[PDB]
RNA sequence: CCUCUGGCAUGUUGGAACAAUGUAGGUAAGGGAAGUCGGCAAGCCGGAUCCGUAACUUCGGGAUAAGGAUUGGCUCUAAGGGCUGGGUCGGUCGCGGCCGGCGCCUAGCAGCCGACUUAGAACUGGUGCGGACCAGGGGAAUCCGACUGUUUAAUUAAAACA
RNA sequence: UACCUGGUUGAUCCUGCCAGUAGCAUAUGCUUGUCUCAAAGAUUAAGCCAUGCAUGUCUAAGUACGCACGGCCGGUACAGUGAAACUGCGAAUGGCUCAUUAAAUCAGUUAUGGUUCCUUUGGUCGCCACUUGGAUAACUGUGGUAAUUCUAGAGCUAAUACAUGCCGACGGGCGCUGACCCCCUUCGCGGGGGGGAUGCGUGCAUUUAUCAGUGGUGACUCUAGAUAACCUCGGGCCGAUCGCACGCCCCCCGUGGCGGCGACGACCAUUCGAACGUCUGCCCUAUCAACUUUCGAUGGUAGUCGCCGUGCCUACCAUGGUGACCACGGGUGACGGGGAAUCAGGGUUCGAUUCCGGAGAGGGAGCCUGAGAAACGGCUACCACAUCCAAGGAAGGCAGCAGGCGCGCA
RNA sequence: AUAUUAAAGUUGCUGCAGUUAAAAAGCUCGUAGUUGGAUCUUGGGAGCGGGCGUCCCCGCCGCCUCUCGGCGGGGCCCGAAGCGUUUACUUUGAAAAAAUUAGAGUGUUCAAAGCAGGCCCGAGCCGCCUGGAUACCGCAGCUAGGAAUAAUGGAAUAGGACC
RNA sequence: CCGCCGGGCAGCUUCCGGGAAACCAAAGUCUUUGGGUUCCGGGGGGAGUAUGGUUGCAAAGCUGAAACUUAAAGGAAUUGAC
RNA sequence: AGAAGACGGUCGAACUUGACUAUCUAGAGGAAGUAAAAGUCGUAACAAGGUUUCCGUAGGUGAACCUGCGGAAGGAUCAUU
């Protein structure tokens, strides 16, 4: 059908070789997937050996992990902004490993908010004066103050990331293989990636 | 070569099997099982080419589906199941009890045991794994996983499987001044104490024996396997004693043998 | 910059760059904490892997690629592949009826780790067999000499 | 080919018809030079990009040889350039200078400007797209004259003269 | 047995060949009493094929209400044979041929720390459950078509086929959360020590990220462990399953527990392998000297696919890669090898042909099922051959074994 | 009849020719190729063994290491390591499908074959005894000895070790 | 004029040893066969032809086959005949 | 749950059309070679072959051949004071 195998290009000295038998059902390709973001659409294939692969056509969420802070909340797939190897398949929106997504940051921000008992993504009173005060409002005191105040200079989060929250997406990088898994698991960019990203999105801007 | 393969031509055969020309264009196969198929003394050839207890194969299938057969005590009704090295073979209905220990030669010999004995087997350690909840195993050369044994059989150690219960009883390390039964190539079934191993990192090793009667030879980690702590086994072995007589030594004991013993 | 000229991050994979909340300015000293491996056969890993900067997947000692089989020696003679090298192992092939030998000369494409800096053509040169990681090439380089002739 | 500036009144007249013959333009089913002294006449071909290019040869050519493909609209992507800027720290003198010490982007980075092209991709239309205009029909051969040049103002442009 | 004779000359010695001489195949001629073995459509035409056969299958143990036989027993479904049909497995082996194919096949050698693996063998296998849903085949009966191993509509009726899905299990055990509570000290904020209801998780496999370094190896990004989540969502998985033979025991009477097999699965090892890779090796040919490259040539980076590793393919870069040590191209009366025939020592030639490996089923291509096929005694196209047609349509593949035609010395 | 091997030292590596029999480029330079002078540890020393001494034979003078492991200070010498400067060469070992071949054994009646056979035994033994060997298997790969031959290194605008 | 030494061109001389020999101190150190290395022949004819390729202003040069034919062609030396 | 169907992709048979390449062949006329043969013309060559032959190279000629230049000894001179 669609083979991959060596028997059919040059050699090394540039000669052809010459096809000594067909094509077999192993020396053998399949048509790609190429995922865009949207409601959850896989199909999954049948393989060698029997087994699954898991086809995703479609892909609207993924579990990105937040790596220093080491939450990984599953997160809407909001969209692909940049992929290292081709424009083209920024400009479709399509899912592949290392495209550097956006993603909803909500998840985190509230984990943020939960765990380090501080604000994330500055408001005047909106936000501050009904919700947070209530997860504070300490009738315990001394125990989970004494651990809230031992989260100290700690939770001085990236300012890159703070920025980030404060808008309200996280650009990621998918690691998992949609095409070949079905899911869009990744991690959030943060430190020297983040800024290198970043960089290459603003000059991609002009 | 489409998938598998599901016969075996004569002469295409293991040579140690003693499998004739004339008779048919096949030999039987091994079924799949715990030894590779050219390590192997097939039910049906154990039976009617070196007893002589059956005739044909339809004889043999016969014997075997009474349940008479009895291989590693459990009862295998397949003539074609691979019985091969250290096993048992128990046959119940007479009470003789095999092993399948190699001779000199390297032709598997028919070396019939005690029925005490026929209880335990003795096995090489192939590897030793550490599965889930941190659960090690061992896998033996005859496909046992056995789990959970002691932390100190490490590879190419020889333990005493029990056979009914299963499970470990009492090993022996792989160190020099040990006894080791060779299972390949050129030293198949000669018998002596190590001596050397050399570690050779990348390709496999050189491990050196010496017989008890002074006659040197090497062979490679794999087909070494150890049966005991110097000079005295932890099993019967076959007359001839694993010790490889020259052809010319061989045909003088065949001469004195002959003419003057009657 | 330096180590990112591709399009992508360029990192090493199996370190972590980012925890960090503590005083004495932003990071270590060495900063990153770079991932090497010993390749074993006694081979010594190079000083240009560990303490060196660069980073590349098929490097043996800093990369996802593991040496075994085969150990071959050749002789360099072309450079101009990037993190790869052509090998000219040379051999007296022998014929039976005239019972005499001739030359025969097999070149090999040869990865080349960016460890080792100052390798000449005409450099005695050792290689490891590997994974095939690249259409022709299936050969890291382990370790150099350059010591017949030309200076040290 | 269409337009502005400027210029004209259709070239010594008008009106009404829309016959034949004409002059000048077009189009034609099926065939395709059967027409004729003779493909005369008209028709095919035509622009650009990308391929691809024979015999023969004075080795320069032949050559747009021949023979193929693509071409619109729209929405994007990538690739090509200039200018200016750091002498920051300390001192002192009037944001500016002068002195001394660091720095010294010496892989450069930052901000500000500006023609125009080339390549690639997505979508899209009743397969239409060099949409009008402009714009080579090809080949195989023979005769003559090497060639470019010249020639009978008003019937001979040639193989004649040079 | 390391062997030579005849032939140029009037004669001679040579160079030199031709001719004899002996093997081995293929054929052919004449001939032929007995017996043991024994090759046999390879050479030409991988040219064409009439007929028949060459792959099916049931145990005590997945479904039996054919009524086709019969029981021995009724009525507590079932008892015992049992065609059929669904279910499962097989049909990828074998057999044939050698067209292709010249570092390709193939051989020795090694890798898979770069993957898959039906089966076998061994490990794992904590309110419908006194057992759920409806569907269909055989069987019954209406048929349609000229015609096929065509099938449609209506009746029924099962399952280990196809579906759904629970008790277990310890308001208990361990991670986080923590309404709160208690003890000590302090001028007191504070500091230290304990306990603790209610919530969320309460993992084998999967995918991602982080942490720490039980057992391992020349060799880890291994194995195992800890945290965070995710579910490859009904089309992730085991989670939690159907059949047969004996037939037992309860500090106890109607219940609750019990061994011996079969069959079934997710994961790990094993085996049979398979699949790619490593090193070294092949006949003639220069009247083949340069070849390869934006239609992957050689590298690099990130993907895609694939069982995985790799220009396998895509994007973006780089300009490499092979060659007189014969690349590239052409040829082969070329499948490779084991081996065969000659032979003193060397060699020379042959190897379609019974073992191993490959490749192929008129030619090309595409794919379904499946552990395994790019299958051909499986399908879908086209081409080329051909067969019935009631002319609307339908079927086909002997390089299986016999046999025919044809080709031919064979 | 034809294919083919020996004959054919008439393809020649072993092993042919090249003054006149066929045959040395008209001559020189010249890269790949092929081929390349001599040179470095030796006599000796000490013993076991053979024909006070002489002549032939056999283990010894792999060095260093103790920076490494151990069969509050140590020895003892093995695992590791400066691995044999880096190969070829040679010898040993390991690994090598069988069939064929070579070749043991064995009266298929003989043989080509085949892998079996043979015994005690009146059969009362209710059986027994043995086989189904070895060799070879280019080249390349792997293993450890040897170091003559042949390559190939190291200290020369200086560098080897030293509480 | 008489010697010696090196290296040239040759000469005579012989049972050096070769060689079918004529001859050759090289054409010797060859079945007692291996210092190194180039080129090159393989009965006679067809044929240095045809064909391609290449060089040359040309004349030609280099490279360079086959079918078919043929039992000898050829070397040296001897006796004759001429 | 889901059949026919359709846009687009992909592999891709096949046909049409060139393009190069190999092997096989017909062909007026031309020009070779070899063989038979009881032809024709001469005599080139071997004896000094009656002009030593022979080589390279030009021109010529019915045919062998001849001539010119420079070579050759494979000469009909190892020698000429
Ligand atoms: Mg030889
Ligand atoms: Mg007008
Ligand atoms: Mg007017
Ligand atoms: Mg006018
Ligand atoms: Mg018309
Ligand atoms: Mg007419
Ligand atoms: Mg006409
Ligand atoms: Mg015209
Ligand atoms: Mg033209
Ligand atoms: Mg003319
Ligand atoms: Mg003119
Ligand atoms: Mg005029
Ligand atoms: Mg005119
Ligand atoms: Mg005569
Ligand atoms: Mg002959
Ligand atoms: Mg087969
Ligand atoms: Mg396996
Ligand atoms: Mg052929
Ligand atoms: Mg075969
Ligand atoms: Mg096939
Ligand atoms: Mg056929
Ligand atoms: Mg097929
Ligand atoms: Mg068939
Ligand atoms: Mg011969
Ligand atoms: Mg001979
Ligand atoms: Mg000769
Ligand atoms: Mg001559
Ligand atoms: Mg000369
Ligand atoms: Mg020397
Ligand atoms: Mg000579
Ligand atoms: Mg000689
Ligand atoms: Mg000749
Ligand atoms: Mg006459
Ligand atoms: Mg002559």
Redesign the pocket.
Same mark, same amino acid.
């Given at each position: 059908?669609?083979?991959?195998?060596?028997w059919?290009?040059?050699?090394?000295? /540039?000669?052809?070789?010459?096809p000594?038998?067909?094509?077999? #059902?192993?020396?053998?390709? +399949?048509?790609?997937?190429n995922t865009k973001i949207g409601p959850?659409?896989?199909?999954?294939?049948?393989?060698? /050996?029997?087994?699954?692969?898991?086809?995703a056509l479609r892909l609207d969420?993924g579990?990105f992990?937040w790596?220093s802070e080491?939450?990984? +909340?599953?997160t809407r797939i909001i969209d692909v902004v940049y992929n290292?190897?081709?424009?083209?398949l920024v400009?479709t929106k399509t899912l592949?490993?290392?495209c550097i997504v956006l993603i909803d940051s909500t998840p985190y921000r509230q984990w943020y908010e939960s765990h380090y008992a501080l604000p994330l993504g500055r408001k005047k009173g909106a936000k501050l004066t009904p919700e947070e005060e209530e997860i504070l409002n300490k009738?315990?005191?001394k #125990?989970?103050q #004494?651990k809230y105040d031992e989260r100290k200079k700690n939770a001085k989060i990236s300012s890159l990331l703070e920025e980030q929250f404060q808008q309200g997406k996280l650009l990621a990088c998918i690691?998992?293989?949609? /095409?070949?898994?079905?899911?869009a698991? /990744?991690?959030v960019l943060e430190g020297k990636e983040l800024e290198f990203y970043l960089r290459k999105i603003k000059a991609?801007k002009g | 070569?489409? &998938?598998?393969?599901?016969?075996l031509?004569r002469?295409?055969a293991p040579?140690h099997w003693?499998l004739?020309?004339?008779?048919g264009?096949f030999a039987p196969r091994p079924?799949?099982?715990?030894?590779?198929?050219?390590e192997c003394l097939p039910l049906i050839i154990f039976l009617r080419?070196?007893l002589k207890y059956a005739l044909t194969g339809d004889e043999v299938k016969k014997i075997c589906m009474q349940r008479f057969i009895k291989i590693d005590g459990?009862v295998?009704a397949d003539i074609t199941?691979p019985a091969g090295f250290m096993d048992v073979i128990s046959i119940d209905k007479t009470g003789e009890n095999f092993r399948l220990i190699y001779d000199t030669?390297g032709?598997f010999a028919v070396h019939r045991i005690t029925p005490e004995e026929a209880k335990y087997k003795l096995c090489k350690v192939?590897k030793?794994?550490? &599965?889930?909840?941190?659960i090690?195993?061992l896998?033996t050369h005859d496909?046992?996983?056995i789990?959970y044994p002691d932390?100190l059989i490490?590879?190419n150690d020889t333990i005493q499987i029990d056979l009914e219960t299963?499970k470990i009883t009492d090993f022996i390390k792989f160190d020099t001044g040990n006894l080791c039964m060779v299972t &390949? &190539?050129?030293?198949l079934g000669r018998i002596g104490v190590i001596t050397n191993r050399?570690?050779?990192?990348?390709?496999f090793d050189?491990v050196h024996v010496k017989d008890a009667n002074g006659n040197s030879?090497?062979?490679?980690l794999s087909?070494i396997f150890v049966i005991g702590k110097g000079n005295k086994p932890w099993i019967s072995l076959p007359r001839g004693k694993g010790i490889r007589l020259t052809?010319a030594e061989?045909?003088d004991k065949?001469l004195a043998a002959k003419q003057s013993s009657g | 910059?330096?180590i990112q000229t591709? *399009?992508?991050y360029?990192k090493q994979? =199996?370190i972590?760059q980012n925890?960090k909340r503590v005083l004495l300015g932003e990071t270590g000293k060495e900063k990153l904490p770079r @991932?090497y491996?010993?390749?074993?056969?006694?081979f010594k890993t190079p000083k240009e892997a560990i303490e060196g900067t660069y980073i590349?997947?098929?490097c043996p000692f800093t990369?996802?690629?593991?040496? *075994?089989?085969?150990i071959?020696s050749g002789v360099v003679t072309?450079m101009?592949?990037?993190? =790869?090298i052509?090998i000219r *192992?040379? @051999?007296?092939? @022998?014929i039976?009826?005239?019972?005499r030998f001739?030359?025969?000369?097999?070149?090999?494409?040869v990865?080349l780790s960016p460890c080792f800096r100052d390798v000449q053509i005409g450099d005695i040169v050792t290689v490891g067999?590997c994974?095939?990681?690249?259409? =022709?090439?299936?050969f890291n380089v382990l370790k150099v000499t350059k010591?017949?002739?030309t200076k040290?």
């Open positions: 059908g669609i083979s991959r195998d060596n059919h290009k040059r050699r090394k000295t /540039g000669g052809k070789r010459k000594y038998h067909k094509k077999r #059902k192993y020396e053998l390709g +399949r048509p790609a997937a959850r659409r896989i199909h999954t294939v049948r393989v060698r /050996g029997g087994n699954k692969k898991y086809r969420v579990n992990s790596g080491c939450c990984t +909340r599953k290292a190897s081709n424009n083209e400009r592949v490993k290392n009738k315990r005191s #125990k989970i #004494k690691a998992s293989r949609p /095409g070949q898994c079905g899911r698991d /990744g991690y991609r | 070569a489409r &998938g598998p393969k599901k016969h031509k002469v295409a040579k003693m004739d020309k004339l008779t264009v079924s799949t099982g715990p030894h590779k198929l050219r080419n070196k459990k295998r199941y030669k032709r192939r030793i794994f550490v &599965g889930t909840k941190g090690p195993h896998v496909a046992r996983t789990r932390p490490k590879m299963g &390949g &190539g050129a030293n050399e570690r050779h990192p990348g390709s050189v030879f090497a062979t490679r087909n052809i061989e045909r065949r | 910059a330096d591709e *399009r992508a360029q994979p =199996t972590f925890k @991932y491996k010993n390749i074993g056969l006694g590349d997947k098929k990369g996802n690629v593991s040496i *075994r089989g085969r071959l072309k101009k592949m990037q993190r =790869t052509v *192992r040379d @051999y007296l092939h @022998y039976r009826k005239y019972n001739e030359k025969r000369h097999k070149n090999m494409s990865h067999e994974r095939p990681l690249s259409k =022709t090439v299936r010591a017949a002739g040290k």
